[PDB]
Nucleic acid binder design. Structure first.
Ligand SMILES: Nc1ccn([C@H]2C[C@H](O)[C@@H](COP(=O)(O)OP(=O)(O)OP(=O)(O)O)O2)c(=O)n1
Ligand SMILES: *[C@@H]1O[C@@H]2Oc3cc(OC)c4c5c(c(=O)oc4c3[C@@H]2[C@H]1O)C(=O)CC5
Ligand SMILES: [Ca+2]
Length: 343
DNA sequence: ATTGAATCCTTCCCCC
DNA sequence: GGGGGAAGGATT
């Protein structure tokens, strides 16, 4: 009668991988950070286990104000590389419960189990063989979501977490389509959470009050045609294998600068590790982005008829860096690169 | 107040 | 306006 989307989402993943390697931390509040040798203890949180969130230590906030909230808690520099090996291992596992996998991010996969589950009953059934396998061969807990489409399966997971599992039968959908808050619909942030709020929309069903031709100039086609597409219990987007369309790095400079010969070594580092992550792909395009003193991003790109040798990237960055320097007047505080249009 | 990394949607311009 | 290229925008 339709499709069943199974969504797996790792719990406080980054932090949880720190525990799985060093239980000399479980129970205690773990905070995964990122800095730069800037001032010291400067940067932003990446994620924190649940025993640290209760106190106001979520991702995003500067590790600085976090200390004044939990000077007791354990702070760990982030090892993105480590979490990535764990993740590629869990992912490969899921890969054998359905060849119809996606992988929204490093800790999210969407499985299309419509082919191996006659009904939600057996879905939940797989919902658990899975949670257990993952927890067995990785000692990691994951929350699972199940429903008719990728969007709701996610919303599910984000309710059953942590460590949970949940289901949303056509009935609960309609109940959520009229009851779930709006700032909770996957794909909406505070910015769009304002236009919708005051305009006849406080909840997903509200986007049914007003016609798109009035919001299709407030949140723009794709978005509106997407919200409404849901409330109007019509949404049914497929589970396609996501592809990496851009890799790159950006670093943070000790001091803010505008002296091109000072910046260049930074930009080059960014290109080298950036070219490492790039593995064995060949970008035809390339952009240089810089974070000025007042976090206002400025980027400049170039696209070629052919791939970009590393030797040519190094050389093509400066021009893009200079282009920036001339036009924009402010200083530079964060400089990096980003390759695109892969062959 | 710093530090990721990526998507995809949008919006202003050349050009058959 | 359409291909596509380009720089800023708004989530995750
Ligand atoms: N500004 C943001 C917001 C989100 N994300 C990513 C981080 C997560 O890993 C992924 C989203 O997954 P979830 O919100 O479902 O949370 P998870 O439980 O998988 O992640 P977390 O490690 O926070 O528990 O999107 C990101 O990179 N940058
Ligand atoms: C961007 O600046 C901060 O740095 C990071 C780094 C993260 O992961 C490596 C990160 C994550 C999440 C998040 O919400 O924020 C960050 C941030 C901060 C951002 O504001 C997640 O949910 C997972 C990783
Ligand atoms: Ca979580």
């Amino acid at each position: 009668h339709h499709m069943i989307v199974l969504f797996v989402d790792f719990d406080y993943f980054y932090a949880q991988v720190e525990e799985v390697l060093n239980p000399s931390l479980k129970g205690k509040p773990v905070v995964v950070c990122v800095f730069s040798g800037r001032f010291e203890d400067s940067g932003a949180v990446a994620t924190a286990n649940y025993e640290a969130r209760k106190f106001g230590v979520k991702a995003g906030i500067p590790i600085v104000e976090a200390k004044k909230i939990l000077p007791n808690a354990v702070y760990l520099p982030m090892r993105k590389e480590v979490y990535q090996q764990v993740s590629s291992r869990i992912m490969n596992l899921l890969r054998e419960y359905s060849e119809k996998i996606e992988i929204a991010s490093i800790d999210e996969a969407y499985l299309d189990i419509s082919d191996k589950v006659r009904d939600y009953r057996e879905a939940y059934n797989l919902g658990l063989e899975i949670k257990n396998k993952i927890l067995e061969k990785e000692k990691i807990t994951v929350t699972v979501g199940i429903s008719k489409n990728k969007v709701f399966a996610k919303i599910a997971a984000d309710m059953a977490k942590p460590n949970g599992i949940k289901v949303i039968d056509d009935e609960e959908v309609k109940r959520l389509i009229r009851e779930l808050d709006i700032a909770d619909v996957p794909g909406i942030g505070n910015i769009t959470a304002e236009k919708l709020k005051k305009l006849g929309i406080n909840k997903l069903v509200d986007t049914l009050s007003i016609e798109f031709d009035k919001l299709k100039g407030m949140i723009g086609e794709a978005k509106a045609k997407y919200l409404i597409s849901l409330a109007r219990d019509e949404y049914n987007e497929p589970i396609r294998t996501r592809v990496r369309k851009s890799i790159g790095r950006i670093v943070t400079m000790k001091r803010n600068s505008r002296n091109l010969e000072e910046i260049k070594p930074y930009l080059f580092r960014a290109i080298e590790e950036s070219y490492y992550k790039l593995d064995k792909r060949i970008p035809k395009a390339i952009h240089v982005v810089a974070v000025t003193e007042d976090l206002d991003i400025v980027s400049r790109g170039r696209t070629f008829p052919h791939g970009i040798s590393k030797e040519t990237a190094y050389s093509e960055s400066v021009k893009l860096l200079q282009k920036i320097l001339e036009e924009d007047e402010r200083k530079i505080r964060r400089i990096g690169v980003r390759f695109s249009k892969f062959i």
